[PDB]
Amino acid sequence: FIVEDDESLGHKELKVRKGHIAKLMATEYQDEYTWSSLLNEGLVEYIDAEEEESILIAMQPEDLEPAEADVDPAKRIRVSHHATTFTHCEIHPSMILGVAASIIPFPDHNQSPRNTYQSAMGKQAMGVFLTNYNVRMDTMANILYYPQKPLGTTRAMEYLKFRELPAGQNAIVAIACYSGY
Amino acid sequence: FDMGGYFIINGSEKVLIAQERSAGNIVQVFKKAAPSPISHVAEIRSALE
Amino acid sequence: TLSHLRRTNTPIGRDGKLAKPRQLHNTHWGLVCPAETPEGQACGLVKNL
């Protein structure tokens, strides 16, 4: 996102605005205002690595913008938008991740490495790799009888098409010592 | 749902894996080891794009 | 199938191991996944976009 202080009615601020957004969900619902538009209309821009060097970014669009004029004890604890040089803003951090890590629930609550595992173990599970398995003659292949999407979810899922082709089930799990097996 | 992006050679679904490397034509300076007739170095690998 | 389509290889070397590249870089932020990489062996040499 581009934040140019073009706010002749305030501070430095995001190009795209509630209108743009609603004009998108507009065409979303219709299933004209695309990604390409967000681009050409100089609202969002592709910044590579090298160029990334010479810029400043804001994580949260909001939070990291309006002025400072109580604080939730249960939530975590973030630093702040200490500056106004913000030339760009992060569409959403969650996007640093990847296909794998994207299905991991609450990855921001696991000792780091734990997530690198789920990252290659999930590549060893079962589900429904396609809907035409019935018509494919691949050497070896597995399909879980009754797949269920998951209870816990991720906004990332949605695009990875997880809920339409899950890879596991929701088990009523209990955590306790029993027979000792 | 298939997102393609792959090939179908002699039958099987083949995937060309992304290959990483150092960008060509660019200058970089590197320091040398204790035992070295040379102090520092200016490298540039030129490749007709 | 998705995660395989967005995978990258990074030629090893003689003095392999070290960590010059097997390490997770700052520059990497946003471009490559931080958590997803193979355990041991070519760890960090194969990255996922």
Binding site: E13, L14, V16, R17, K18, G19, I21, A22, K23, L24, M25, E28, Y33, T34, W35, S36, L38, V44, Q60, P61, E62, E65, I91, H92, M95, V99, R155, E158, Y159, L160 | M3, G4, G5, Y6, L16, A18 | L2, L5, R6, L49
Partner: peptide, 30 residues
């Protein structure tokens, strides 16, 4: 106020538009 700010949840709508066009395997294709 087709020009007011933009809060959290809004981000998504954008992202949606992204993959709408681009698509998970973009790069391999292009």
């Amino acid at each position: 106020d087709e020009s007011a700010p933009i809060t959290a949840e809004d981000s998504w709508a954008v992202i949606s538009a992204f993959f709408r066009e681009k698509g998970l395997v973009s790069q391999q294709l292009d």
